[PDB]
Amino acid sequence: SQILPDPSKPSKRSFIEDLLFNKVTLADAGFIKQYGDCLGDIAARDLICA
Amino acid sequence: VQLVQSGSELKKPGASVKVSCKASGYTFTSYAMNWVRQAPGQGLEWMGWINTNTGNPTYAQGFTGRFVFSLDTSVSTAYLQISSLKTEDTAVYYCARELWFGELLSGDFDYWGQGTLVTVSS
Amino acid sequence: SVLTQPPSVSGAPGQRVTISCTGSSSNIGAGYDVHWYQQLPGTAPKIIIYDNSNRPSGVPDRFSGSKSGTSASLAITGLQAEDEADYYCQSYDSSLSGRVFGGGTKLTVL
Amino acid sequence: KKFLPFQQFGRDIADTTDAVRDPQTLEILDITPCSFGGVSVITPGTNTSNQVAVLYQDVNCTEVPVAIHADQLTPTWRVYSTGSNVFQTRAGCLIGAEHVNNSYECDIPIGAGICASYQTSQSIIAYTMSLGAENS
Amino acid sequence: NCVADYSVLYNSASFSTFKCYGVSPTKLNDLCFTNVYADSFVIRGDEVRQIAPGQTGKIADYNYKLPDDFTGCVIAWNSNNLDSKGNYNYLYRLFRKSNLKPFERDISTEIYQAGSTPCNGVEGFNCYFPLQSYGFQPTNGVGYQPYRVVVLSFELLHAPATVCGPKKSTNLVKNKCVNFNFNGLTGTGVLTESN
Amino acid sequence: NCVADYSVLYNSASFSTFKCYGVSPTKLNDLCFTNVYADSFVIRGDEVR
Amino acid sequence: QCVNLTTRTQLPPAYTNSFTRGVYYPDKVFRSSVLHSTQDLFLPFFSNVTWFHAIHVSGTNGTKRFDNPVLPFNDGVYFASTEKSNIIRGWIFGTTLDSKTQSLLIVNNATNVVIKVCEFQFCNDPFLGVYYHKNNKSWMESEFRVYSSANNCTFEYVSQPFLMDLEGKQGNFKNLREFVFKNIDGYFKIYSKHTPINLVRDLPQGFSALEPLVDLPIGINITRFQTLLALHRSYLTPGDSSSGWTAGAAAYYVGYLQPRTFLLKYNENGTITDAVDCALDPLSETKCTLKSFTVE
Amino acid sequence: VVNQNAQALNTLVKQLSSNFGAISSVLNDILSRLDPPEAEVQIDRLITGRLQSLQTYVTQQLIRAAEIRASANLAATKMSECVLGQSKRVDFCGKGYHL
Amino acid sequence: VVNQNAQALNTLVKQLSSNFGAISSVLNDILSRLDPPEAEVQIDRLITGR
Ligand SMILES: *[C@@H]1O[C@H](CO)[C@@H](O[C@@H]2O[C@H](CO)[C@@H](O)[C@H](O)[C@H]2NC(C)=O)[C@H](O)[C@H]1NC(C)=O
Ligand SMILES: *[C@@H]1O[C@H](CO)[C@@H](O)[C@H](O)[C@H]1NC(C)=O
Ligand SMILES: *[C@@H]1O[C@H](CO)[C@@H](O)[C@H](O)[C@H]1NC(C)=O
Ligand SMILES: *[C@@H]1O[C@H](CO)[C@@H](O)[C@H](O)[C@H]1NC(C)=O
Ligand SMILES: *[C@@H]1O[C@H](CO)[C@@H](O)[C@H](O)[C@H]1NC(C)=O
Ligand SMILES: *[C@@H]1O[C@H](CO)[C@@H](O)[C@H](O)[C@H]1NC(C)=O
Ligand SMILES: *[C@@H]1O[C@H](CO)[C@@H](O)[C@H](O)[C@H]1NC(C)=O
Ligand SMILES: *[C@@H]1O[C@H](CO)[C@@H](O)[C@H](O)[C@H]1NC(C)=O
Ligand SMILES: *[C@@H]1O[C@H](CO)[C@@H](O)[C@H](O)[C@H]1NC(C)=O
Ligand SMILES: *[C@@H]1O[C@H](CO)[C@@H](O)[C@H](O)[C@H]1NC(C)=O
């Protein structure tokens, strides 16, 4: 049950895979909809905009 | 600015005891070193002071000979040495910081140590 | 000692109590300042007033003092439970005595 | 070096002067630069502690204040160029490290079997590494 | 605190020597300027190359020194009909114990000596008065006629500028790629609102 | 056999053309030049270049 | 005119520790959330700073310590002062200060701030005399003795007229003024910041960044400098002009800059909150080289 | 992998602050202060400096890509052996007798 | 491997002998011979080559 996927989460990641995703941090600004920002945004002061 | 003194000692009458005082966080040669005793359940007595530059002591009345003031600038630790201990010498000795102003000293003791307990008994 | 202090004082919490001090013409009458110290039981003394009028940093505003010629005084306003300590005064006498401390006055809070 | 007569100075393969002759007494000299920039520092994480030890690479502990000219620097540089906890190894000179005779698993590698770690009164210790548990 | 129209000086024929180092002379009117300083003196004309930065010479070492990063212009023109008459009022320094720092002056008239002689206000052996005059005469040839030299020094974009070129400010436009100009700072892009 | 300082030649006003390429004029006396060739002639004023 | 000062206790100065002080903005460019290295003249961390006092204690003899000596001027200096009655009225900068080489003067004579670079025949002991009357409670100044002559001058600056308290405050020091003076390419750059403080008798522990105040194109040669001080005269100080005076409690600190490497930290608000000396200790040197204020 | 990519990307961005011996590191500053008869002697220093930085970055990316290529081939080999079957090889699918 | 390392280090040492178009391959001679306005021009070529 720890390694098999579960239907409770929206993603098909298991409990071990969910822990692996949360244990990875980025020293740079992350790749999450970064061009949704940097356009018409007041706080255009970050690494991925620049 | 810390004034750390030595621990407590128990000594026999007629013996000799040395008391050290560590000073830190400040320029040790800029401030004069002062020593103040206090008998248990009594007032504070000032037995004198010693300069940190030239090292010359200046004892008060009744403390000549038995009390020795000395220091060294490598570790910047003042020394208090008492010889021929008697029963009436049982007191707590405090170190007081005074700025080196000149031949006439002021009356501002800004910092005090934790004190050293010496007891003379048989 | 040359400086003379009252033996003890007492007062209710919250009122005003004034501790007096007297000297001579060689210690206070000569123009030298009078310093005051507070000593909790079991701890080192702590100066609360220097140069007869001034409070160091961290000292509450309830403490005040002044000098008038030969004599000097210190004032306490709004007594609380933490003021139960021994207060010591000191000054500079002539060269035959040097630094002279007071007799000490225990302050009682009822 | 037998300097045949008017041949005066010298150079190495990298055209830097290594030998020279005094123009007055006609004596022969050898030249070795003295700059030093190869310093190394062994320190734990700042979130853990703030104590810092410094390794002086490939230089003797008896020649530290001359090579780096510590007396013309800050006293904080002087106290890290001369102190009680001064140790010499194959890798160089360590100042501030507490040498011990015990052996543990390597934590911060230095070189030539020397490893450092944070040990409790907390201080930075230096020790020879242990290959493992002795077994027969 | 002005608007400086530089297009009345370099285009004029009144100046026989005009060169700039930090900026182009044709691009002086499109920039805004901060703390413009003007220096002026008289030159014999054959040492005008010493006024250039990174140049050695008597006037450079002991009279007027420019730094290696000098951002400015030097303006020189002939003034033989104006200054010369045997005019001895224009003095210059010959000797000093050390070379001058850039952008500094020395008006001290102490007696220079060149040895072990302790001269005290006396022109003894190898003791000289440190100032001499050109003596500008109208009959002097090229290289000896008096030359009036004007030196300009300033700073660029270091502060909100007070001196600007003679260019009108147009209406502000936004949300389209345009060539902006903010006190001499140019570029291209969409200028977006921000708080 | 020179002890002669090289600065005294160009601080005077007796010269008209003095520009050096290999060695900068500010530190001519700080280097020993082993041997110095001294060549001289007289030409027209427009042939200096 | 000029008068010498008598009845003063001539004593050698002392030393104290400057805890990461003297840091100023190297440029007028806004930065935020970035670590910026620099190469400029700076005060090194935990350097010896010379202590001066202007304090006249009470008593029969006392100690009339009034120190305004001529001090050397290196490539850069750092000035810090704790004030309560505005005793320090500026400085003088020059080389010989005897009307042989011209010198600059910075004097605040209550109403105006005066900057003059003239051929000053400076006094042996410059001072400013403030009088306190008893008929009314005025605190005016009637003595201005800084120089003997002003024969040749080349620069002049007079600020707008204003007023100050000039009051003999009895309490502890409450105003901390820090100054940094530099002389590069004839530009007398001044960095300053006024900061409130509550200390007693020492230089406070903390960090501060000095904003650029004003740039002075002067172009004179400065090798020595001296500090101006105020002087109190009243009915309690009898005698002539050379002995009938009292000091009034004030102190200031004089430190020297040095060409160093600094690592400057800018916060999200655009202010300098911390700095790292790259040549103090190997820990800060590693922080400077790695360009990180933290290090695993 | 994350930190080296972030450090190399930040080093690529911060290299634009260098002037490489030119008057200024800003391209618009040179274009607004100089004319093309004498601006091109200042531009090509910035051209050579920035291109050499771009050569260095791509070369380091190619070396890092080869390191990932070796690791990906090892990961594919471990997936095809340890997951899709039982391996008799010692210490390939972990320490001990692999199941 | 040993010979390749030795050859690479020897080539790295020997590359300092190239003047790269400057008047000399040693920086001390250029510093003691030339004013900084042309010394910096020499140092640009030397720095680029090294
Ligand atoms: C104050 O005292 C000083 C001496 O300490 C006087 O200094 C004069 O100094 C110059 C050169 O520095 C000497 O040539 C003079 O001879 C000195 N004067 C005397 C009287 O010896 C200074 O003049 C005094 N100030 C006043 C106003 O007299
Ligand atoms: C140079 O003079 C010194 C001092 O007399 C002498 O010892 C030395 O031998 C001389 N050298 C030569 C090459 O003549
Ligand atoms: C950092 O230190 C805090 C306590 O100061 C601790 O709780 C935390 O776990 C530490 N973080 C790491 C990554 O060690
Ligand atoms: C460590 O070993 C050395 C000899 O190798 C000995 O001199 C020293 O006393 C030992 N120290 C301790 C703490 O055992
Ligand atoms: C300050 O002076 C003391 C002795 O006067 C000296 O030991 C110390 O190294 C000095 N510190 C600095 C930073 O100059
Ligand atoms: C203090 O002043 C008195 C009166 O002028 C004098 O007699 C005495 O010597 C002075 N004290 C000292 C220590 O000089
Ligand atoms: C009264 O005060 C004014 C200003 O406050 C002062 O000018 C005047 O001199 C004072 N009166 C006397 C008699 O001094
Ligand atoms: C300025 O100095 C000159 C000497 O160079 C002197 O003759 C002149 O009188 C001075 N100016 C004034 C106003 O005194
Ligand atoms: C300034 O004056 C001093 C005084 O001797 C002198 O040594 C120095 O050369 C002068 N010039 C400079 C730039 O310091
Ligand atoms: C930064 O500026 C904001 C807005 O004025 C202010 O609220 C805040 O206290 C300042 N300081 C910090 C550390 O955020």
Encode G40-82 in three state secondary structure.
EEECCCCEEEEEEEEEECCCCCCCEEECCCCEECCCEEEEEEE
Supply the DSSP string of D71-134, one letter for each residue: GGS-HHHHHTTS-SSEEE-SSEEEES-EE-S-----SEEEETTEEEEEE---EEEEEE---S--
Q: Decide if H12 touches E, using CB distance below 8 A.
A: no
What is the 8-class DSSP label of residue A35?
T
Query: How are beta strands E163-164 and E2-3 bridged, if at all?
Result: parallel
CA distance linking residue G49 with residue D118, whole number of Å: 36
Supply the DSSP string of I4-50, one letter for each residue: HHHHHHHHHHHGGG--TTSS-S-HHHHHHHS-HHHHHHHHHHHHHH-
Atom of ligand 6 nearest to the CA of B103: 13
Cβ atoms of residues B99 and B108 within 8 Å: yes
CA distance linking residue D77 with residue D86, whole number of Å: 14
CA distance linking residue E42 with residue E62, whole number of Å: 15
Cβ atoms of residues G90 and G110 within 8 Å: no
Cβ contact (<8 Å) for F31 and I34?
A: no
CA distance linking residue H84 with residue A12, whole number of Å: 22
Interface test with E, best of H19, H25, H27, H32 (most E CBs within 10 A): H32
Cβ atoms of residues G253 and G202 within 8 Å: no
For residue D116, the CA-to-ligand 3 centroid distance in Å is: 21
- Nearest 5°: the CA angle C59, C63, C65 is 125
Helices (H), B15-61: none
Q: Each residue of F9-24: b (16+ CB within 10 Å) or e?
A: ebeeeeeeeeeeeebb
* Sequence-ordered list of residues with C-beta below 8 angstroms from that of F29, at least 6 positions apart, any chain: F5, F6, F7
**Which chain E residue's Cα is nearest to I35?**
E54
- Beta partners for C56? none
SS3 state of residue G282:
helix
- Nearest 5°: the CA angle E153, E62, E9 is 30
Residue G141: name the closest of G156, G126, G127, G153 by CA. G127
Which sign, positive or negative, has the C-alpha torsion G279, G281, G283, G284?
A: negative
For residue G215, the CA-to-ligand 10 centroid distance in Å is: 29
Resolution of the entry in angstroms: 3.5
State the virtual CA torsion across D122, D128, D133, D135 in degrees, nearest 10: -150
CA distance linking residue A29 with residue A26, whole number of Å: 7
Spell out where chain F has E strands.
Answer: none
Cβ atoms of residues C71 and C23 within 8 Å: yes
Give residues 43 to 72 of D whose Cβ lies within 8 Å of G: 43, 45-47, 50, 52, 54
Cβ atoms of residues G199 and G172 within 8 Å: yes
Structure tokens that stand for F32 in this block: 């020993």
Tell me the Cα Rg of chain E.
Answer: 22
Report the 10 Å Cβ neighbour count for E4.
18
CA distance linking residue D102 with residue D100, whole number of Å: 6
Cβ atoms of residues B52 and B71 within 8 Å: yes
Cβ atoms of residues G23 and G275 within 8 Å: yes
SS3 state of residue A49:
coil
- Nearest 5°: the CA angle F26, E119, E94 is 35
The 3-state secondary structure of C33-78 reads: CEEEEEECCCCCCEEEEECCCECCCCCCCCEEEEEECCEEEEEEEC
Q: Which residue has the tokens 């949300």?
A: E175
CA distance linking residue I35 with residue E55, whole number of Å: 9
Q: Which residue has the tokens 């390419």?
A: G185
* Sequence-ordered list of residues with C-beta below 8 angstroms from that of E168, at least 6 positions apart, any chain: none
Structure tokens that stand for G132 in this block: 């306190």
Q: How far is D26 from chain G (nearest CA, A)?
A: 40
Which protein residues touch ligand 9 with a CB less than 6 Å away?
Answer: E 98, 101; G 95, 221, 223
CA distance linking residue G236 with residue G244, whole number of Å: 8
What is the 8-class DSSP label of residue H5?
H
Of A24, A25, A28, the CB nearest to H9: A28
Cβ atoms of residues C38 and C48 within 8 Å: yes
On chain H, the residues whose CB falls within 8 A of the CB of E23 are 33-34
Is G3 a pocket residue for ligand 1 (Cβ < 6 Å)?
Answer: yes
Q: How far is A9 from chain E (nearest CA, A)?
A: 39
On chain I, the residues whose CB falls within 8 A of the CB of D16 are 16, 26
Cβ contact (<8 Å) for B112 and C104?
A: no
SS3 state of residue B9:
strand
State the amino acid at position B25 in one-letter form.
G
* Sequence-ordered list of residues with C-beta below 8 angstroms from that of D66, at least 6 positions apart, any chain: none
Structure tokens that stand for G97 in this block: 């200060």
Supply the DSSP string of E17-35, one letter for each residue: EEEESSS-GGGSTTS-BEE
Residue G177 half-sphere exposure, CB side, CA atoms within 13 Å?
15
CA distance linking residue G292 with residue G263, whole number of Å: 9
Spell out where G113-205 has E strands.
Answer: 113-131, 141-158, 175-184, 187-196
Q: Which residue has the tokens 């003691």?
A: I32
Report the 10 Å Cβ neighbour count for G10.
10
Which sign, positive or negative, has the C-alpha torsion B26, B28, B31, B34?
A: positive
**Which chain E residue's Cα is nearest to H38?**
E24
Q: At what angle do helices H36-78 and H2-14 cross, to 10 degrees?
A: 180
Residue B56: name the closest of B103, B97, B108 by CA. B103
Q: How far is D79 from chain G (nearest CA, A)?
A: 9
Structure tokens that stand for B55 in this block: 């090292």
- Beta partners for C102? none
On chain C, the residues whose CB falls within 8 A of the CB of G171 are 54
CA distance linking residue E110 with residue E96, whole number of Å: 10
On chain F, the residues whose CB falls within 8 A of the CB of E46 are 16
SS3 state of residue E157:
coil
Interface test with H, best of A24, A26, A28, A49 (most H CBs within 10 A): A28
CB pairs under 8 A between F and I: 14
State the amino acid at position G27 in one-letter form.
D
Query: How are beta strands C63-68 and E2-3 bridged, if at all?
Result: unpaired
Cα distance from N-terminal residue to C-terminal residue, chain E = 29
- Nearest 5°: the CA angle B89, B94, B100 is 125
Cβ atoms of residues B91 and B17 within 8 Å: no
Residue G207: name the closest of G161, G244, G176, G231 by CA. G176
Experimental approach was cryo-EM
Which protein residues touch ligand 8 with a CB less than 6 Å away?
Answer: G 151-152
Cβ atoms of residues E32 and E164 within 8 Å: yes
On chain H, the residues whose CB falls within 8 A of the CB of E53 are none
Ligand 1, from G99, G124, G125: best to mutate by most atoms within 8 Å of Cβ?
G124
- In this complex, does chain F touch chain E, defined as having at least 3 beta-carbon pairs under 8 Å apart? yes
Cβ contact (<8 Å) for H33 and E22?
A: yes
Is D25 a pocket residue for ligand 2 (Cβ < 6 Å)?
Answer: yes
Protein residue with least CA distance to atom 18, ligand 1 = G124
On chain F, the residues whose CB falls within 8 A of the CB of I32 are 27, 30-31
On chain C, the residues whose CB falls within 8 A of the CB of G200 are 50, 56-57
Cβ contact (<8 Å) for G283 and D52?
A: yes
Q: Each residue of G21-39: b (16+ CB within 10 Å) or e?
A: bbbbbbeeeebeeebbeee
SS3 state of residue H79:
helix
Q: How far is E102 from chain I (nearest CA, A)?
A: 15
Which sign, positive or negative, has the C-alpha torsion E136, E140, E142, E143?
A: negative
Structure tokens that stand for E32 in this block: 């805004």
